[PDB]
C-alpha cells in the first residue's frame, strides 16, 4: 500500500521543527519504469511531512529527520525521482530522501526556496548512474528539461535563489562610475585581451561605459555553489571582503594619524609581528577583534596588540631564508615550484623585438660563473644547467610599471647549477631594463653574482629580492589565479549546463569543483577588482590582471598534465623504461617526485572508472551530453583559444581519460601545491616580497651609502612597505588555512553518491592507494640522504603533497577542489 520514507533537512539558522509539519512541505514521487501517454514517468500525489523522527542515532550536526509515507502501488513501478515544494516563507537545505522496502536513496544537498519563487518545480533523481543511452525511457525528457532549466536563456539579472549557469567576460572589475582612474580593460572576447570566461551575473551596464558591468553588493553564484558552513570560522571566503572594506581602512587610519611608525626600520621590526606583536590604537583593535574569520588571524590582549602566527619558514632558523641554498631550493620545493626550466645553450636567448626594447643579448658571461669546476660545455651536456626566466615575460610591462609612483622592477633571469650533491645553487642574476631612443631614465641593466661580504653581498641580496618580486607576482597571478581558479571555472559551468546529475562523468568531476565559483566571485569583488587587494599590495598595481591575459595567450590545456609540463620545461625526459614514463633531471625535485605519485594514483582511478560506463571508443563518440559538454567548454568557456590545434577531440576512451585526469589534477594537487605554502613561506615578507619600490642605487648617492651602513634598511626601503605588508600577510594567512569541513582527495561528502558497487570499490582502492603514498612520502622526508632538497637549512619537511590534513594552517593536505 505505502512506501516508508525519511527526509533529512537543515533549517536555515544552521548553515522550531513542528513548523515543517501540517501543509508546509510536499513531496511527489516520479516513476522510472511506468510512463504516461507522452512517455513521461508517472507522478504521485502531493504528500506532506508527517512528524519528527527521533529514532535514528546517526544524524550530523544541525540536521533533522522527518517521517513521510507515500501511497504507491506496484503498478506505478519503481520510483526514480521526486518533486518537492516548500510552502514556508524561509528556505531550507534539503539533504536526502531514503525509501525503504532494496532501499532507494536520493542525495540532494540543495536549498529549496518558497515555491512561488520558482518557474518550475524542484526535481531530484535517485542515486543511479546513466550515460544518456542508458537513461530509463520515462526519465529521458525530465533529464533534458532539467539541463535546459540550468542553462537559462542568456538574459536577466541573476537572483540569490537562481540555479542558472552561463558565461560572461571579465568586464566587472573596473569601477568607472566612481572614477575614470578605476576604469579597466575588458578581459576576454578580443585578440588583444584573450581570457577564460567566468559565471554570468547580469547586473547590466555602468552609466559611463556600456561595456563594463555595474557594481553590486552581492556577486551572484548559482545557489548551491554558495556553501553554507556550520561554524562561521569555516567561512574563509568572506574574509577578503572584510579585509578590503573594514580592516584595511582601520589600518590606514593608524598610519594617517601617526600612531605607528610608517616604515619598518630593521628586520627585527618584521619579526616582532609574530613575537610580541604590533601595538595599534584602541579603536583600531576594536574594529578588527569581533569580525568572523578575521578574528582568527591574530592573537590579541583585547586592547592594543595584534600578534600574527609564527611562519613555518622561521620555526627552526629565522635567518636561513637568506641563504643561497634556500633561495634555489624554494624553486623546486617552495610556494611556486613549477617555473624553473632546463638550459641547454649559453648565453640564454630572448624572443623579444630589439627594435622596441633595444639589444636583447644576455650580458652574463660563462667565464664569470662558479660551476664547482665544470666547464660550461660540461654543465650543458650533463644537463646540470637550469634557469628561472622572467626576462621575456616581464620586459613588455617594465616601462609602464616603472612610471608608477612607488613601483620599480627589473625583468629578471636567474642561472642555477645542479651540484654533484644533488642540490641547486644560484650562480648569476641578470636585472634587465628596456631601452629606447628618447628615454628619460639613466638606469641601466646589470648582472649580479653571488657574494657573502661587503656592499657586494648587499647588492646580491637585493638582486634576489628583485627576482622574488617577479616570482611572487607570477605565482599569484599566473601559477595560482590563472592556472587554477580562472582556468577551471569554464569547466564547472559547462559540466552543470550539459552533463546531467545522473551522468557518470558529472559524478566523477563535480567533487573537484566544490566552492570554486564562490571563491572566484568573491575574488572578482574584492581580490582582483580595481583598488582591490592584489592591486593595492602587488608590484603591477592597475596592470596586474591584464598581465595574466597576456600570459593566457600561451596557455595550453594538454601542457597542464604533469609529465608534459616537466618535459616542456626541460626538467625531465621521456623514458618508457621508467614507471612514470619520464626520467627526472633533478632526481630529488620534491614537487615533481611527489606529484608523479599523486598523478599516477588519479590516472589509475580514472582508468578504472571510465570502462565501467564506456566499453569502446564509439560509446564516447555517441554520448551526446559528453559531446555538447566538450564542444561548449572549448568553443565558449575557453573560446578565445578555440582556433588552437592542440585541444583533444574527445572521440576515444583515451581522450576521455586524458581530459578527466587533467581536470582533476588541476583542481586538487596542482592547486594544493601552489596554495597551501603561501603563509608558511610568505609570512615573512623578506622571504617573499610582493613589490619593489626603487631600482639599484648609483654610486655616490645617499642610497648607495645606506647599502654599506644599514643594509637591512636598504632592503626594507626596496621591498613592500609596512602598511601593504600588514594587509597582504592577513590575506595569505586566510588562503593558507584548511576549513574543518574540507573534503580531501580520496574522500566524498556522501557514501551513497552512486548505487554502482563497482564504482564504489574502485573509489575505495583509490583512497587506500593515497594512504600508501602518504607513508612513502613520510619515509622520503625522514631519509637523511634527501635532507638538502626536502628540508633545506629552514628544516621544513616538504609535506604540501601529503594527501591528508587536520584543520588549520598545516602546510599539508590535498583538497578535492579549488576551495580557497
Ligand atoms: Fe587558491
From Swiss-Prot:
It holds the Pfam family PLAT. It is found in: Cytoplasm. Its cofactor is Fe cation. Pathway: Lipid metabolism; oxylipin biosynthesis. One of its GO terms (molecular function) is oxidoreductase activity, acting on single donors with incorporation of molecular oxygen, incorporation of two atoms of oxygen. It catalyses: (9Z,12Z)-octadecadienoate + O2 = (13S)-hydroperoxy-(9Z,11E)-octadecadienoate; (9Z,12Z,15Z)-octadecatrienoate + O2 = (13S)-hydroperoxy-(9Z,11E,15Z)-octadecatrienoate; (4Z,7Z,10Z,13Z,16Z,19Z)-docosahexaenoate + O2 = (17S)-hydroperoxy-(4Z,7Z,10Z,13Z,15E,19Z)-docosahexaenoate; (4Z,7Z,10Z,13Z,16Z)-docosapentaenoate + O2 = (17S)-hydroperoxy-(4Z,7Z,10Z,13Z,15E)-docosapentaenoate. Changing residue 476 to A: Reduces catalytic activity. SUPFAM superfamilies: Lipase/lipooxygenase domain (PLAT/LH2 domain), Lipoxigenase. Residues 11-126 form the PLAT domain. Fe cation binds at residues 480, 485, 671, 675, 820. Induction: The hydroperoxide product serves to activate the resting enzyme. The activation is accompanied by the oxidation of Fe(2+)entadiene structure. InterPro entries: LipOase, LipOase_C, LipOase_C_sf, LipOase_CS, LipOase_Fe_BS, LipOase_plant, Lipoxy_PLAT/LH2, Lipoxygenase_dom_3. It comes from the Eukaryota. PROSITE patterns: LIPOXYGENASE_1, LIPOXYGENASE_2, LIPOXYGENASE_3, PLAT. Changing residue 476 to E: No effect on catalytic activity. Inactive below pH 6.0. Monomer. This is Seed linoleate 13S-lipoxygenase-1. It comes from Glycine max (Soybean). The lineage of its organism: Eukaryota, Viridiplantae, Streptophyta, Embryophyta, Tracheophyta.
